[PDB]
Amino acid sequence: YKLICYYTSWSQYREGDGSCFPDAIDPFLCTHVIYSFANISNNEIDTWEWNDVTLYDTLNTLKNRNPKLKTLLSVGGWNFGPERFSKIASKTQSRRTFIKSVPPFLRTHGFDGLDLAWLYPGRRDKRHLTALVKEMKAEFAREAQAGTERLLLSAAVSAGKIAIDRGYDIAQISRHLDFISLLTYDFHGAWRQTVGHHSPLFRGNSDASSRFSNADYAVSYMLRLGAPANKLVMGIPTFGRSFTLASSKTDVGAPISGPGIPGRFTKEKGILAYYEICDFLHGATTHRFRDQQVPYATKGNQWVAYDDQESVKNKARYLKNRQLAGAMVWALDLDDFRGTFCGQNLTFPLTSAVKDVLARV
Template sequence: MYDANGREVLANGLNRRIVGYFASWRTGVDGSPSYLVNNIPWNKVSHINYAFAMVDQNTYKITIDTSATSPEIGLTWPNVAGASMDSTLPYKGHFNLLAQYKKQNPGVKIIMSIGGWAGGTGFYTMTTNADGSINTAGINTFADSVVAFLRQYNFFDGVDIDYEHPTTNNQAGNPDDFSISTPRLKGLMTSYNVLLKTLRQKLDTAAATDNKYYMLTIAGSASGWILRGEENLSGLQYLDYASLMSYDLHGAWNQYVGPNAALYDDGNDAELKAGGVYGASQYGGIGYLNTDWAYHYYRGALQSGRINLGLPYYTRGWKGVTGGTNGLWGTTPTVSSTVSCKGIATCGQGATGIDNVWYDLDTSGNPVPGGGNPLWHALNLQNGIVPDYLDAYKVTDKTITGTYVPNYNSTLVAPWLWNATKQVFISTETEQSIQTKAQYIVDRGIGGAMIWELAGDYAWNASMNGGKGEYYMGNTLTTDIYNAFTAAAPYGNKKAETTLPTTSAAVGIILDQWPMGDNNYPITPKMEITNNSTQTIPGGSTVEFDYPVSTPATMADQSGFGLTNTTAGYTGPNNIGGFKNNYNHAKFSIPTWQTIAPGQTVTVALNYYLPISGPSNYVVTIGGNKYILQQENPDATVGYK
C-alpha cells in the first residue's frame, strides 16, 4: 500500500494518482448513453471511486439500493460485450463487474464513495443531534456498518466521504437538506472531525484483523466561502488523501458568469468584484475562487502528495449573458423561482435544451437549467454537429443556432464556448487546459488528479451519426493525464519545507472555540496550548508555526502574546497567476510572567481573514531547546516529557 518513503504504491506505472469517479446511474436502462465498468480505462487509472452509497438517516448505516433493479447488485447487461455477469458471485450489477475487473487489475484501488450532492442527507442526522451535539452512537453505528460493508463486498479498498457540506455556514449544502441541516449547524464541524477520527480507528482495527489496509479519503470543498465555515479541517490528519472539488466554482446558482474550474485568479472575477473582495485591504487582493487557492488552503495541513486536484469532465453554462469578454465575467438576469432554482430563492439564467443534456430535475420533474454537459457534447456543439443521442436526453429542439466559438484564457487556464447569437456561455475543459493542469500537479509535487466523472471524457467516433461521425465517450483527456503522471517524479512526501528539530515535546496545540461560519469574519478561533508533559513550561518559551498563503501574512493575536509574522509567503498585491510559495510563518512567546504547569492550557486569540487549514510544522522552544510537537510527529523521540 505504502512504500518505505510513505508514498502510496500506485498501479499502471503511475507516480501520481488518477482517481476517477464512476457514476452508478449511467446504466443505459432509460435509453440514455451508458457508461459501464467495462468502459473504465483500467490501464490508465490508480483509483476508482464508485458514486454513491448513502447514509440511512434513521438507522445511521451505509446503504445501497438492494432492489431487483439496483444498479449496484441487480441489473445485468446481457448484450454488452465485456459486461457479462460472473454467476459464482452472490450479486449482479456494477458490483459483479467491479469484482471481475478488480481480479484482472488488482493494483487499481476501488473506493466506495458515500454521499454526494443528492445523497448526503443522512450525514447530518448520523453525526449530529438536532440540538447540535455529537451523535456519538450514530457515528459508531455508521463506522461499524462501513466495516461490515467492506467485508461483504471485499473488492472495495476503502471509503470516500463525500459530505456536501459539514460547514457551519447557513444554507451552504443541498437546499433539500436545509430543514435538517440548519438546526444542527453549530455542531456539524465538530461531529465531522469525530466521524473521520472514528472511521480511521475502526478501519485500522479491521485492517489488523483482515490483513488488508482500508483507505479513508474525502471529497473536500474548494470554495473559500464554504471553507470559512469548515474551520481548519482538523480531521484531515486521519485521511490517506483529500481530493478537492476544485470545480463548480462558478455556475448558474447565481448570475455571475465565469469558469467552472479556473486554475488561477485573473483579478477580474465578477462574483468577487461584486462582493468587494479585491478592494478590501484585509483580503490582500487574494482571489479565492480558483484551484490554486484551494490547493494552498489544503497545503496548510497536508503534504502535497496527500492532495489531489479535481478536474471536471463536464460543463457549466448560462444563457442571456451580457457584458464581459465573449461572455467571460459577464452576467445574466436573475431568476426568482424556488422550483427552477432548485430550492433557493434566486439564481442565474442557466443554459437549457441542447445546451443542457446532463441535468438534474426540479421538484416538478423538469430539467434544472445549468448548462451541464459531458465534454463530448460540448465538442459536438463547437463543431456544429447535431448528435444522434439527443432523443435519449429528451432534447426536443435539435437545431444548432449560431456558432459555438472556442475561447481560452491562459491567465485563468480556462476554456469556454461563446455563442453570441444565443448569448450562451459554456465553461469547458480541453486538452490544452487539462495538460496545463496536469503539469501544474507534476511541478508542485501534488499527489494527483481526481476526475468527476469518467463518462464525460471523449473520443472521435467516425461510425456514429449515420456514419458522419461525432464526439462520444472516450479516454482522450485521461490518456493525457496518464502520460504526464507516468513520466513524473514521485510526489512530495514532506509537509515542512525547512529542517525541523528531531525530538518532540509533549505539548498539544489545537484551534478551537470557532464562531459559526456566517459570524466568522474576521476569523477568530482560539489557539489552545496544553502542557502534556510532567514539567512546567517557563515563561518566555516560544511557539512558531507555518500557515498557508490562502490568507495574507497578517495573522494577529488579541491576547498580548506578541504574535509576529516572520516570513510572508504571500506578499501581494494579488495572486494572479498563482501563489509563489506555500507558507507564511508566525511566532509568539509565552509572557515572561506566565508559566504553563503540567496539564494546564493557555489560550491565544487569533485573528485572520481568509480560511486556512492547519497550522502545521509547529516548533516550540523551551529552555533554549527546540522541539517539534508530539501530536504532529508521534514517531519522534520525545525530548520534553
C-alpha cells in the same frame, strides 16, 4: 502519482451512447476508481440503485485484469441531504453504528475503501466531521488486525475558502485520511447572473474580488492549513457548465438569464458532458481566458465554460510542480468514454490527457 476517477451510478440510465456501465472503464487508466454514492439507512451503509450489487461486482471484476487497481465506494453526494449527514455524526450512538457497518459491507462487495462525500459540513459540523474521520479510521485499523489489507479512507472536500474555514478542521482530518480530493471545479457561484468559469486555474490579473475562487489559491490554502502535499488530490472536471445569455454580450461579465439548455444525453440544465461539448463546438466560437488558462465557447445565446485537453494538461503540470499526490477526475461517464464524439478516436480523451502528464515524470 495517484489518478482518482469517479464513476456515477445514475449514468447507466442515459439514452443511447450516453449509457455507461463499469464495463466501459479501461482498467489501466486510473489507479483508483470511486463508485458514486452509496447511501445510509437505519444508520447503516446501504445501496442506492436497485442493481448496485450487480454493478459493484461488474466494477470490481476489472481488478481481475489489473491487480493493482483499487476501488472505493463513496457515501453522500449532492442528492444526499447534508442534514442527514449532520444528524448521523452529531449523535455518537448513530455514528458508531454507521462506522461499524461499513467494513463488513465493503468487504462483502469487494471494495478496498470508503470515500466520504459529506457535501459541505456547516459551522456547527466541524467538530463531528473530525470525530467521524477519527473513529472511522480507528475502526479500519482494528479490522486489519484480522489479517487483511487495511481499508482506505478518503474524503471529497470543498475548495472554497469560506466553506473550508466554516466546516473543516483540515490539520486534524488530514492526519487520518489516506487522501483528500479538492473539489476545485465549483468556483463560479450558482447564485448570480453573470458569465464566468467554474474551474479557473489562476486568479486572473484582471478582477480584484474573489481571488479565493481558483485552483491555485485553494491548493496553497490547504497546504497552509496543514494538509500534506502528499495527501492532496486536485480535482479536474470532465464536464462543462452552460448558461443562457441574456444579451448579445459574449465577453467576461456578460449578463445571464439562466442555465444553458440541457444536452441530448445528459438532460440537465446548466451541465454538459465533455462528449456533448465536443458536438457543441461545431459552429461555435472558441475563446480562452489567458490568465485563468481555461476555455469557453458560445453559439447562439448559449455560453459554455469547459475544460479541454490543454487546460487539463495545464492543471496536471501545476499539480506536479507543487508536488501533490495526484489528480482526481470527476465523472469518467462524462468524458468521451466511447471515444466516438470528440474527433480523435481516442477513448477517455480528457482523463488520458491527465494521465499523460502524470506519467512523463
